[PDB]
């Protein structure tokens, strides 16, 4: 029994065990929370808020571990209302949490928040790749438009903003981002 327990523990990454990133077949999962929303599979907004609040914490921990200070935004990991307060100008509130009853004309704040988080992840990828070009992340990102290129396949591009976008493409984009985070986590843990 002791040998089995030791062999299990010797491979238990701390970040991977705490914020476990995995697939559900169509939903990118963090700690068994479903970061997505599909018609055939509904997702209450509370679960999405929890998923964002956990992804924010994971990326905040990795950024502090690497010592990176993001150029243009600050990550505030608040439990179930996490938000990115724009570093360059502390006036605009960007919440990674939505209260339902969508009014898309006024709820551009959530879209801006997701775009800013994609920007932060792009900076993280830039640092990772510049540090070592031998390691390459599986997906490509573009921040001028808020898109994720499907470099792992046909090359179709997907939008991370729910507005102007379908639910399926949104979920697939978030799945690609979570895969990016998992591989970046692997590299970050390996480098140290």
């Amino acid at each position: 029994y002791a040998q089995t327990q030791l062999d299990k523990l010797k491979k238990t990454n701390v970040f991977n065990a705490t914020f476990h990133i995995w697939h559900s077949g169509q939903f990118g999962t963090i700690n068994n929370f479903r970061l997505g929303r599909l018609p055939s599979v509904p997702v209450e907004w509370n679960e999405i808020n929890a998923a964002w609040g956990q992804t924010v914490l994971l990326l905040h921990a990795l950024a502090n571990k690497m010592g990176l200070k993001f150029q243009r935004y600050r990550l505030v990991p608040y439990g179930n209302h996490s938000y990115l307060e724009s570093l360059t100008d502390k006036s605009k509130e960007l919440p990674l949490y939505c209260s339902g009853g969508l009014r898309f004309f006024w709820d551009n704040k959530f879209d801006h928040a997701m775009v800013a988080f994609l920007d932060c992840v792009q900076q993280f990828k830039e640092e990772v790749e510049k540090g070592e070009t031998r390691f390459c992340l599986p997906y490509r990102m573009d921040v001028e438009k808020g898109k994720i290129e499907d470099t792992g396949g046909s090359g179709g591009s997907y939008s991370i903003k729910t507005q102007f976008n379908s639910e399926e493409q949104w979920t697939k984009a978030l799945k690609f981002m979570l895969t990016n985070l998992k591989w970046g986590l692997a590299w970050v843990s390996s480098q140290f």
Partner: peptide
């Protein structure tokens, strides 16, 4: 592309496990 993504996940987890095992062995 679902199978390809699942293969990506499996390979990433295997690499993480191998890297951590190497780190622990070097610690030893």
């Amino acid at each position: 592309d679902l199978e390809k993504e699942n293969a990506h996940f499996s390979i990433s987890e295997s690499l993480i496990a191998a890297i951590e095992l190497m780190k622990c062995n070097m610690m030893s």
